[PDB]
Design a protein around this ligand. Structure first.
Ligand SMILES: [Fe+3]
Length: 332
């Protein structure tokens, strides 16, 4: 086999860096070994990867979009795989979780408080906000008229939107220290952070994914329910008949160069050794379960069960698909 080499993973929080460096220690004698570099935000990681300071990061589809734009031009090389009733899938469902018995519908969201995974993320932002704009609930004639943040802050009374910087109302519901409560890696960030924002009474609704309630409250699951687009409420387990969209899996992105082979070699081996069937204490994926949300979705989502290599000919637009890609274009 070819000679040994190293890949540099870019992390977005100290818990992620710690997990990455645990994986480093466990892979140091492999042909492809690992180092870990932490940045303040995923965008710093995109920049670092485009500048050949790091090699890979897993991103939500909304950030896969950003990573593919000039001057970065990163492409997705591996997709997360989730459980499915048929076996497995490389997409997930965006849902709007509410507490059982609060009755209000999708048509009654004005003036509510809301919990989001992060600005510009699929389930947490692009899908719910784009949907509410399309329905005419959120009035927004396009970027030139004013920011999306401004329009959302006029609609919800207060929110937690990790990463929001234009509208202070979008940080009002966030938990944590002043300097970090509205950061993209804050306590209420991610699917699980947004769920805990709802659980804690800081939002009336959490814009999360189909596994989120089960990941965080498996024994209180049916104290929650879902807001359906048709105006109904349905059980958490009914997401296939009560979702806002199906969206492409989070993906590992990388430069369009030959380092992709080493990145995939490392990941292929790592998921064989540290995947759902591992003998180790270290799990590449999760595992899911009740615990503090800042421990969740580190490097990869806790709900991932494998990675599937993306064909080289797929870029970010093909990966996300033309329809969602164009939906994101219309919000910027
Ligand atoms: Fe996502």
């Amino acid at each position: 086999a070819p000679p040994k080499s190293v890949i540099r993973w870019c992390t977005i929080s100290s818990p992620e860096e710690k997990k990455c460096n645990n994986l480093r220690d466990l892979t140091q004698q492999e042909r492809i070994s690992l180092t870990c570099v932490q940045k303040a935000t995923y965008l710093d990681c995109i920049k670092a990867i485009a500048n050949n300071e790091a090699d890979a990061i897993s991103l939500d589809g909304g950030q896969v979009f950003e990573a593919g734009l000039a001057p970065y031009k990163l492409k997705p090389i591996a997709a997360e795989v989730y459980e499915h009733t048929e076996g497995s899938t490389t997409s997930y469902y965006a849902v709007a979780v509410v507490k059982k018995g609060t009755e209000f519908t999708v048509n009654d969201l004005q003036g509510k408080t809301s919990c989001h995974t992060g600005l510009g993320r699929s389930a947490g932002w692009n899908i719910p906000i784009g949907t509410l704009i399309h329905r005419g609930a959120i009035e927004w004639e396009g970027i030139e008229s004013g920011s999306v943040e401004q329009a959302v802050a006029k609609f919800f009374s207060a929110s937690c939107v990790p990463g929001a910087t234009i509208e202070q109302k979008l940080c009002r519901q966030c938990k944590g220290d002043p300097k970090t409560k509205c950061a993209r890696n804050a306590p209420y960030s991610g699917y699980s952070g947004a769920f805990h924002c709802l659980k804690d009474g800081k939002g009336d609704v959490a814009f999360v994914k189909h596994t989120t309630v089960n990941e965080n409250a498996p024994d209180q699951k049916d104290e929650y329910e879902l807001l359906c687009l048709d105006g109904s409420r349905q059980p958490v387990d009914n997401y296939k008949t009560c979702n806002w969209a199906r969206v492409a899996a989070h993906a590992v992105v990388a430069r369009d160069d030959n380092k992709v082979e080493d990145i995939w070699s490392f990941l292929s081996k790592a998921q064989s050794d540290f995947g759902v069937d591992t003998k180790s204490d270290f799990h590449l994926f999760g595992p899911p379960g009740k615990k503090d949300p800042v421990l969740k979705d580190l490097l990869f989502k806790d709900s991932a069960i494998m990675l599937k290599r993306v064909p080289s000919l797929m870029d970010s637009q093909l990966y996300l698909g033309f329809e969602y890609y164009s939906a994101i274009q219309s919000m910027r």
